[PDB]
Amino acid sequence: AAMTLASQIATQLLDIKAVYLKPEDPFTWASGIKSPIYTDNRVTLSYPKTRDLIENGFVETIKAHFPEVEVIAGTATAGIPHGAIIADKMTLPFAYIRSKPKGNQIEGRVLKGQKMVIIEDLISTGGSVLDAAAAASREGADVLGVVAIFTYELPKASQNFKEAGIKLITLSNYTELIAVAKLQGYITNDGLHLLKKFKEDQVNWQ
Amino acid sequence: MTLASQIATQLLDIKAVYLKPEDPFTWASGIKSPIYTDNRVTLSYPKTRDLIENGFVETIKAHFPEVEVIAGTATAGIPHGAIIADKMTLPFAYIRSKPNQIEGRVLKGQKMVIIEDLISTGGSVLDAAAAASREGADVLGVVAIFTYELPKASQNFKEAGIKLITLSNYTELIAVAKLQGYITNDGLHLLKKFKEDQVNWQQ
Ligand SMILES: [Cl-]
Numbered sequence: 001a002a003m004t005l006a007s008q009i010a011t012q013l014l015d016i017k018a019v020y021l022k023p024e025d026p027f028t029w030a031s032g033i034k035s036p037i038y039t040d041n042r043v044t045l046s047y048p049k050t051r052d053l054i055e056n057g058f059v060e061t062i063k064a065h066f067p068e069v070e071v072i073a074g075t076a077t078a079g080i081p082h083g084a085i086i087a088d089k090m091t092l093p094f095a096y097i098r099s100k101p102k103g104n105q106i107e108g109r110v111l112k113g114q115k116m117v118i119i120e121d122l123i124s125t126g127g128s129v130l131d132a133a134a135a136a137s138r139e140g141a142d143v144l145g146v147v148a149i150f151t152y153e154l155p156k157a158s159q160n161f162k163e164a165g166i167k168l169i170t171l172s173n174y175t176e177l178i179a180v181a182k183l184q185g186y187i188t189n190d191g192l193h194l195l196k197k198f199k200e201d202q203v204n205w206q
Numbered sequence: 207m208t209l210a211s212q213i214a215t216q217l218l219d220i221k222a223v224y225l226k227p228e229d230p231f232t233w234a235s236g237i238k239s240p241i242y243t244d245n246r247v248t249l250s251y252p253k254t255r256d257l258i259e260n261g262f263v264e265t266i267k268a269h270f271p272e273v274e275v276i277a278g279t280a281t282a283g284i285p286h287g288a289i290i291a292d293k294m295t296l297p298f299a300y301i302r303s304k305p306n307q308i309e310g311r312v313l314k315g316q317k318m319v320i321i322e323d324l325i326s327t328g329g330s331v332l333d334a335a336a337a338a339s340r341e342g343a344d345v346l347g348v349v350a351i352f353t354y355e356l357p358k359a360s361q362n363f364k365e366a367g368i369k370l371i372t373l374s375n376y377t378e379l380i381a382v383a384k385l386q387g388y389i390t391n392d393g394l395h396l397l398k399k400f401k402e403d404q405v406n407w408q409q
Contacts, residue, residue, distance in 0.1 A: 042300075042309045042310050043310060043311050045288070045291070045297070045298040045299065045300075045309075045310045046275070046297040046298060046299055046310040046311040046312070047297070047311075048291075048295045048296065048297065051291075051292070051298070052292075052295075055292065071250070074285070076281060077280060077281055077284070077300075077309075078309075080281065080284050080285055080288070081278070081284055081285070081287075081288035081298060081300065082288075083285075084249070084284070084285035084286075084288040084289050085288050085289060085292045087249070087252075088255070088256075088259065088289045088292065088293075089292075091252050091256075092252065093249070093250040093251065093252065094249040094250060094255070094285060095249065095250055096246075096249075096281075096285065098281075107246040107249075107281075107282075108246055108247060108249045108250040109220070109247045109250040109251075110250065
C-alpha cells in the first residue's frame, strides 16, 4: 500500500495479464517488428478491482491537471469504456470520437468552446489520440489535454505531443512497469535489460 | 410518468429522437421512416444519462440477478454498458461488429447481459449475441434503451430465443410527442400506422 499509482496499476496489469512481458521469447507486432511486450488494457475492463483503480486514478488526475474540464471524450474504441465511467463518476457530459466520419467524428453533443479532456487507453506514437484532438478542435471543442492509462514512453510520442502543443498525462508507464515486473519476478535481469533496449530502439534491441 | 415516458420526454427534449411523419427518413432497406434516433446524445446530458443507466441497473438487478459480465454492443452500446458495469461492480466486456469479436476477458459459460442503445430490427445485437455465444458466453438476455416495437424485431428475438427488455418504447414516446406538441394528431396517426406497417403507412 506504499506504491505509487503508476506502480499499483503496473502490478495489476501484470497480474491480470493485461500486459505480457516475454523479452527472450518476443511477440511479433504488425510490420515485422519483434517486441518484448504485449499490451491489451481492454482486459482491465473485466477486472472490477483493477478497473476501479484505473477509473479512480483518472478522475483524480483530471481534477488535478484539468479542473475546469466540461466534457470527457473517449477515443474510439478502447478509450470509450474508461471515458464513459469517468464522465459518470464526475457527473459530466460524455462524448466519443470516431476514428473516421461515418462535422462528423464526435458522437454526443459538444457545445462550441466546451473544455474537453480526451481519454485514451494506450500511447505508442500518440497519433490516434492526437488525431482525435484535431477532430474535436475542428468541431468546436477547447481540448485541455489527454489522459491515458499507459505509455510505451517512445521519444516519438513526446515529440508528437510537444509539436502539437497538447498536454499528455498517463496513469502508468513503461519504466515503472518493467521495474515492477523485475521486482515481482515476471522478468529476469537479462529480460529487464532487453526491455530497456526496446525502449531505446524498436528495430535493433535484440 | 412511468420510467419509459420519463425517458421518452427527455429523448425528445434533447433531440435524441426526431419525428418527421410528414417528411420521412429513408432506410437502407428502402423503407421510409417517420423516426430518426440518435441515443448517443443522451451521453452528453448527465441528468438523462443517469436516469437511463440507473434504469438499466434496476432492470438487470431484477431480471438477471445471476449476470457475471455486462457486455456492450460496439460502438453505441459500449458507454452505457461500461457505466452499468461500474455501478454493479461487474466485469465489463464489449463485442465488435465484425471479426475474436469479444474484447475484454470472458471465460467459457460466463453469464452475459448484452447492452444496446436502439432496437430497430434487432439484427445487430442478435449478431453480437451469436458471436459472444460462439466464443463461450452464456447470453442471458439483451437490454436496450429504446425500441421501435417493429414486428420484425419481435420475430428476430423469438427465433433467436433471446429475452429483450427495453427501458422506453415507440408507442409511449409518440404519445409524449403529441402531448408536448412535437407532432400533431395527423403526425401521430402516421406514426401509429408506420409501426403497424412500415411499407404502406403513407398510403
Ligand atoms: Cl447514425
